[PDB]
Design a binder for this molecule. Structure first.
Ligand SMILES: [Cl-]
Ligand SMILES: [Cl-]
Ligand SMILES: [Cl-]
Ligand SMILES: [Cl-]
Ligand SMILES: [Cl-]
Ligand SMILES: [Cl-]
Ligand SMILES: [Cl-]
Lengths: 183, 183, 183, 183, 183, 183
C-alpha cells in the first residue's frame, strides 16, 4: 500500500533544496537525508504510492544532470518505512535474524518479503555506505518465525544474486542484543 | 559419529579395483560408485571414522597419479549417509526445503548442520554432476522445522561461499512432491 | 487455443520452488520439469494462453537473476502438449517422418505447423540437450500425410534457419520404429 | 569371421533414416543406435564382413556431409558383438579383468585379442561417451585366464598408446561383481 | 542411364573451341554453353555415360590450365537433361514444389532423386549465377506427389549441407504459376 | 623387509668418496655404482631399512649441492635386490614377461608387486640410462605365473603413469631368451 522513494544527487546543496521541495510537494516522509562519500547526497522518502511518484518525478525533473539515481520501490509493508527511518520496537528478547545484502533496494525487498512471509518484527533496515553498498535488515521473534523470515528474505536477495549472508541468533546475548536491535 | 569418504579417480578400471579393495579393507559401506563425465570415477564410502580414514588412505596410496581427489568428512549424522546412498522415507506430505550448493563436500556439511539443528527428515543429497558441481539436499517436515533446517544449512554453505540458492515449499503440489522427495 | 510456457533457471532449487508456484498460480499443466547440464533447470507448461502468460510472468518476476530464459509459444495445437510431456499413441505401423531442429521453440513451431497442415499423428517432440540444442519431432501415418507434414515442418524450421535435417522412412524396420516412435 | 561397422553422423534424423536403411540393405545387426553429445548420432553394427562393408558403404554414400566418421573393424571374434550390444553371461563368480582405453576401436581390438589369446568370457565392451572417449572391456574367469587376457588386451591398447589402465580383481565382492559384470 | 558433363573454363575462346571439339568427339548434347561472371565459360553436356566421360576427358585434357572445374554426374533420369537445357511441359495447373540449393550439382542430384522418388513433372533446373551459386528445381503435380518430391529433394541437398529452402505451393496463383513454371 | 637406497651425485669424485663412506657407515650392500651421462654418478644400496636410511642420510648430508637425487624404497622383497645388482638364475626355459617403465623407482615398485603377487623368478631390473630413464624388469616361469606377474607390475607402473609397455613371451626363441634373461 505504501512506497519508498530513492533520490541520489551529485550535490549536497541540490539535495537539500530538492529534499525540501519534495517534502512540500506531497504528503511524503523524509526517511533519510544524508551525504554519502565521495560527495553524493541521498534522499529516502516514505509515503503513499502516488505521493512518492509525484515527489520522485518533481525531484528528478528539478535534479537535471545532478541526478545520480532515482528509484521507486512500490507495494511496501508499513513497518518497512520506520525500519528505514530508525528502529521498530521489540516487545521481548527472543531470536534475532540478520539478512545482509548488496544494495538498499535488495534489502528493502527482502525485508518486505520477510514481513509479509512471517509474524516477525522488522527491527531495522541499515545502510552501511549508500544505495549500492552492504545493507542489512534485522528481524526479531520466535526461532520458527525468525527462521521463516530469514529463508524468505535470503531467497528474495539470492534470486537477484545480491545476498551476502544471513544468520539466525536464537537466544542472543546482551552485548549483542543491544548491538543488533538498538544499533 | 559417522564419516563420509570421497575418492575420485581418473580411471573407471582403477575405480572398480580400488572400490572393491576399500570394501574389503574396513567396515565401510559403498554409498556412491559411479562414472562422472568426462571419464572420471567416483567412490563415496560411509562408516565409522577410523574405517573411512583407513579406506581412503588405502585408496589414495593405491591410486597414485590416477587420483583426482580424496576427502574425509567426519562427525557426520547417521541420516545423512542413506540420503547420499539413496532416499530417506517421508512419513507424510508436509513442507519441503531445498538447499542448492557447489560441491558435495559443502552439501553434506549443510545437510549435516540441518539434521543436528532440526527435527526434519533429510530426504536426499543429490549430486547433479560429480563432487565439485551443483548439489542439493532435500528436507521435509513442519514449515517451522523446514524453515530452521533450510536457514542453518544455507548459512553453512554461505559461510564457504558455496550456496547457490535455497527454497521453502510449504504445501507442495501433487507432482512437484514426487519430483522433490522421490527423485 | 493452447500455449507452451518455457522457463529455464540457473538453479534447481529455484526451479522447483518456481515450478510449484506456477502450478498453484493458474490452471497450467507441468509438461517438463528437469535439470539440464551443467546445472540449469527447465520448466515447460501447457494450458490456456492467459494462464500460461500469467504463470510465465510470475515465474520470470520471482526468478530474478536466476532466469536463463523464458518463452511463451502461443496458439499451439492440443496434440503438441502431450507430445512434449511424453508420447502420443500410434494406431498402426505406417510411414515415419523426423524433422530435426536447433531449439525446442523451432521444433514446437514446426510440429504445430505439421499438425495443422496434415492428418499425421505427432508422436513426440524430443529435446536431446535443453532448449537451444538439437530437437526433433516424430510424425507417423500415410506416406503422403507424412510427406506433407515433413515439408511443412521443414519449411517452418528452415525459415528461421534452424532446420538440421528431415527424413521420411516409409515402412521402417521394427527396430527403428521401436526407437523413433515408441521412445 | 565377423565385423563391426561404425557410422557416426552429425544428425539424429539422418542417423535414424540411415540406420534403418542399413538394416534393410544387408543381414546386419544393429548393436548401437544412440545420440552422443553435442548432437552427433552413433550407429554400431555387427555381422559378416561383406554385409558390414555393404552397409557402411551404403551409409557413407547416403550420409554425404552429415558423416562424422565411418569405420569397419574386420576379423572380430563372435563374442565381441553381443558384448557391444549388451552383456555376455557369466557362468560363475571368479576373477574379473577390466581394460580401459581411449576409443571404442582400441577397446574392440583389445577385447578381440583377449578373446583369441585366452579362455576368458568377454562380459561387455562399454563406451562411456562416444567413439573416441573412455571405453572399457570386462573379462571374467580363472585368475590365470584373466591375467593372460588383461596382459594381451593391455599390450594391444598400449601399442597404439590408447591404454588408460587395466586391473585384475581376483575374488571381487558382491556390490562390485554386480556392478562390473551386470553393468 | 543418362549422364551430365560439366566443364567450366577460365576462357570464352577456349570454351567455344573445346565445346565444339566435344560435340564432334561423341554423341553428346550441348545443354548449356554460356559465359558466367567474371569471365569464366560454362559447358554442360547430356548423353550416354561413356560419351559424356569421353567428352569430359577430351575437354579436361585439351583445357590444361584453363580448366576451372570438370564434373560427371552419372545415372541421371532422362527428364533432368531437358529440364537443364530448357523447360519441361506441364499438362495441367496443379501444386508446385521448389527446392533451392547451393551448386548446380546438388540441384541436379536433388532433381534426379525427386524424379525417381515420385510421379512429379520436373519442370526446370535453374541456375541463377554459375555452377556453385543458388540453383533451384521446380516440380509440378499432385500435392502428395509434390510433397514426396520436395522431401526427397530436400533430404538429398540437406545431406551435403547445400539445401537453401524448399517450398510447396498447392493451388498456385494465375501470375505466380507462369513465373514458377515458364521461367 | 629390505630397502633400496638411491643416491645420484653431480660428481664422480664425490660419488666414489660418498659411496665408500656409505659402505663403512652401515651394513648396506652396493648394488649399483656407476657414471651416468652427462657427468652424474649413481649409487644404489641394498640392505635393511635402518641401515639404508642411515646410509642415505650420511650420503645426502655429505653430498651438499652435489646431490642430484636421493631416494629410499622400503618393504622390498629379497629377490629384487640381486636382480638390481645383477641377474637371478633361471632354472628352465619357460615364458618371459617384460615390463618397461619410466624411472627405476617405478620399475622397482613394479618388480616388487610382481614377486609378492607371484611365483615368478624376477630375472633382472635393468636401467638403460640412469634413475629417471627407461627401465625394464624381466620375469620368467609358467605362462600363468608370468601373466599374473606382468599384469600386477603393469598396474603398479600404470597407477603412477609411468608404464611404457609390457609384453608376454610364452615359448621364447633360442636367441631372444639369451638376450632377455642373460642381458
Ligand atoms: Cl549532511
Ligand atoms: Cl506491517
Ligand atoms: Cl541423525
Ligand atoms: Cl490437435
Ligand atoms: Cl535417441
Ligand atoms: Cl568367440
Ligand atoms: Cl622374495
Amino acid at each position: 500500500s505504501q512506497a519508498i522513494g530513492i533520490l541520489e544527487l551529485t550535490s549536497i546543496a541540490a539535495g537539500m533544496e530538492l529534499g525540501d521541495a519534495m517534502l512540500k510537494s506531497a504528503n511524503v516522509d523524509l526517511l533519510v537525508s544524508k551525504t554519502i562519500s565521495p560527495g553524493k547526497f541521498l534522499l529516502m522518502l516514505g509515503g503513499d504510492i502516488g505521493a512518492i511518484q509525484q515527489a520522485i518525478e518533481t525531484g528528478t525533473s528539478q535534479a537535471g544532470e545532478l541526478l545520480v539515481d532515482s528509484l521507486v520501490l512500490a507495494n511496501i509493508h508499513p513497518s518497512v518505512l520506520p525500519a528505514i527511518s530508525g528502529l521498530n520496537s521489540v516487545d521481548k528478547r527472543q531470536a534475532v535474524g540478520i539478512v545482509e545484502t548488496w544494495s538498499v533496494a535488495a534489502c528493502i525487498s527482502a525485508a518486505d518479503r520477510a514481513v509479509k512471509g512471517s509474524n516477525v518484527t522488522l527491527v531495522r533496515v541499515h545502510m552501511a555506505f549508500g544505495i549500492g553498498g552492504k545493507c542489512y535488515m534485522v528481524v526479531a521473534g520466535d526461532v520458527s518465525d525468525v527462521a521463516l523470515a530469514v529463508t524468505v528474505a535470503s531467497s528474495s536477495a539470492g534470486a537477484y544474486g545480491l545476498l551476502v549472508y544471513a544468520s539466525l541468533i536464537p537466544r542472543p546475548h546482551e552485548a549483542m542484543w543491544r548491538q543488533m536491535v538498538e544499533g
